[PDB]
From Swiss-Prot:
One GO MF term attached to the UniProt entry: ATP binding
Any single GO CC term annotated in Swiss-Prot or TrEMBL for this entry: cytoplasm
Cysteine pairs bridged by disulfides in the record: none
InterPro entries: Mur-like_cat_sf, Mur_ligase_C, Mur_ligase_C_dom_sf, Mur_ligase_cen, Mur_ligase_N, MurCDEF_pg_biosynth, UDP-N-AcMur_Ala_ligase_MurC
Family: Belongs to the MurCDEF family.
Pathway the protein contributes to: Cell wall biogenesis; peptidoglycan biosynthesis
Keyword tags: ATP-binding, Cell cycle, Cell division, Cell shape, Cell wall biogenesis/degradation, Cytoplasm, Ligase, Nucleotide-binding, Peptidoglycan synthesis
Catalysis performed (reactions): UDP-N-acetyl-alpha-D-muramate + L-alanine + ATP = UDP-N-acetyl-alpha-D-muramoyl-L-alanine + ADP + phosphate + H(+)
Main subcellular location of this protein, as a coarse class: cytoplasm
Protein name as catalogued: UDP-N-acetylmuramate--L-alanine ligase
Residues annotated as binding ATP: 114-120
Keyword Zinc: no
């Protein structure tokens, strides 16, 4: 891995970002001087600063002093003072994915793309390669829990990276192996409502593979299977489908572990214990197993990693067990924010929780999304046994009338399967929970916004 010519200091605008911070950590550990700004100081920025990155909170033209190159998050606005000034001083300004691509350039890149499951799959592959003693570099879009970080620099040529389709930015990447987990409507503003344009973009992405490259694609996704003829690279499939190259059979969930068999292309049978719940994770783990098997990694390494898998951050993220005045409860944090993904989480919980109650704390992310998927939210949220609603996490959006938490609560109440409690002052969340808790409750803190931080504050106080 060569040093980049004349690159002394790399400045990140929005350095606390999930993807931004991983790249900064890689480059810091490679020996580059790292600076960055963010509007918020948290665990991520504190870790980077402690490691030796120069972090500023707030944006100012002075923050870019000394930068050889500026890396910008998609979250950053065009009026940002650091961004405007960087261009004025003729300092290269590049997107996050272009810098990830440079990390990938001289590495054996395994890019994990798809709508859902990318963070878990990337973590799984990372852990398999680690267990195989291959000492991979990885850059994930969320925590690899066993690592306690989103990214890690290994001494090998291997790179496992989550590949973001959301701005077509994964087109910068030049991988050796590309996983596509699935394809569903998301980030449609970048694709202008056109599902076909997204389809074309994924095909374009797979065309970045070398002629000898490998695409590992989910056999259970009809859209992905229709795209196989257009790939023009070797395609290996995985899933429950009888036509899958790596076929999952005999799946059972016991508690929060999965048990199943994978039948490989040469009919080799592999009995898997997977340390995370749900058929959806069996799929993610079979993408990971397929990648590893195709790379030549021994079953021992694959099985050990999957059996010990500690999960990805906020993906059915077990926060612990707590004795409360009204019962012993289990708290779990999950990122799921689309109705189908919230449904998957509820299913995984149900299949591990027997006859005990599932209590959900749900925070809708965006008024726009709440508006657009309102009825679907009403239906999926109505599946839980007790429901606490938090106010919509606006993420910069102006309120939309009829698309707030009060409106969701009304509609759910009126459906009559569950009677939701709206909690606006989240300092009261623990008290509301304490009032309604029963022994053996599973409490699912659900959503993409501040709900995770709120749930961890709750956990901490309950310790
Ligand atoms: C788009 C997704 O989310 C992720 C994706 O998972 C990962 C990995 O691929 O790369 C991107 O993270 P990222 O590291 O660029 O940024 P995010 O994790 O969204 O956070 C943005 C960061 O910018 C900061 N920020 C935002 C606005 C601002 O004016 N100033 C500022 O400093 C925020 O405080 C935050 O710390 C994607 N986010 C965006 C906005 O592009 C997705 O997965 O669908
Ligand atoms: Mg996404
Ligand atoms: Mg019910």
């Amino acid at each position: 891995i060569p040093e980049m010519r004349r690159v002394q200091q790399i400045h990140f605008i929005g350095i606390g970002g999930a993807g931004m911070s991983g790249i900064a950590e890689i480059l810091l550990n490679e020996g580059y001087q790292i600076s960055g700004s963010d509007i918020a100081d948290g665990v991520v920025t504190q870790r980077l600063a402690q490691a030796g990155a120069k972090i500023y909170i707030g944006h100012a033209e002075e923050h870019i002093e000394g930068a050889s190159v500026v890396v910008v998050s998609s979250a950053i606005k065009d009026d940002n003072p650091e961004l405007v000034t960087s261009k004025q001083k003729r300092i290269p300004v590049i997107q996050r994915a272009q810098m990830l691509a440079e990390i990938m350039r001289f590495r054996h890149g395994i890019a994990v793309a798809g709508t859902h499951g990318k963070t878990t799959t990337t973590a799984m592959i990372s852990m398999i390669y680690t267990q195989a003693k291959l000492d991979p570099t990885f850059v994930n879009g969320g925590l690899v829990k066993s690592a306690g970080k989103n990214a890690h620099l290994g001494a090998s040529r291997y790179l496992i990276a989550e590949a973001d389709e959301s701005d077509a930015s994964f087109l910068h990447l030049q991988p050796m192996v590309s996983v596509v987990t699935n394809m569903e409507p998301d980030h449609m503003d970048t694709y202008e409502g056109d599902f076909e344009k997204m389809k074309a973009t994924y095909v374009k992405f797979l065309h970045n593979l070398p002629f000898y490259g490998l695409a590992v694609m989910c056999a259970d996704d009809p859209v992905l299977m229709e795209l196989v003829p257009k790939v023009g690279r070797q395609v290996i499939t995985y899933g429950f489908s009888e036509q899958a190259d790596y076929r999952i059979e005999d799946y059972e969930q016991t508690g929060f572990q999965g048990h199943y068999t994978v039948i490989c292309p040469n009919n080799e049978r592999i009995n898997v214990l997977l340390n995370v719940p749900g058929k959806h994770n069996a799929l993610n783990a079979t993408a990971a197993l397929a990648v590893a098997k195709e790379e030549g990694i021994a079953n021992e390494a694959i099985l050990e990693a999957l059996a010990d898998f500690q999960g990805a951050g906020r993906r059915f993220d077990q926060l612990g067990e707590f004795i409360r005045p009204n019962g012993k409860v289990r708290l779990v944090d999950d990122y799921g924010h689309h109705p189908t993904e919230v449904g998957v989480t509820i299913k995984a919980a149900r299949e591990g929780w027997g006859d005990k109650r599932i209590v959900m704390i749900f925070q809708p992310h965006r008024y726009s999304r709440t508006r657009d998927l309102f009825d679907d939210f009403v239906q999926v949220l109505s599946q839980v046994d007790a429901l606490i609603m938090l106010d919509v996490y606006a993420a910069g959006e102006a309120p939309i009338v009829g698309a707030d938490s009060k409106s969701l609560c009304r509609s759910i109440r009126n459906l009559g399967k569950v009677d939701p409690i709206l909690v606006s002052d989240t300092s009261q969340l623990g008290d509301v929970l304490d009032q309604i808790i029963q022994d053996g409750d599973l409490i699912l803190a659900q959503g993409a916004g501040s709900v995770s931080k709120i749930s961890r504050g709750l956990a901490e106080s309950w310790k």
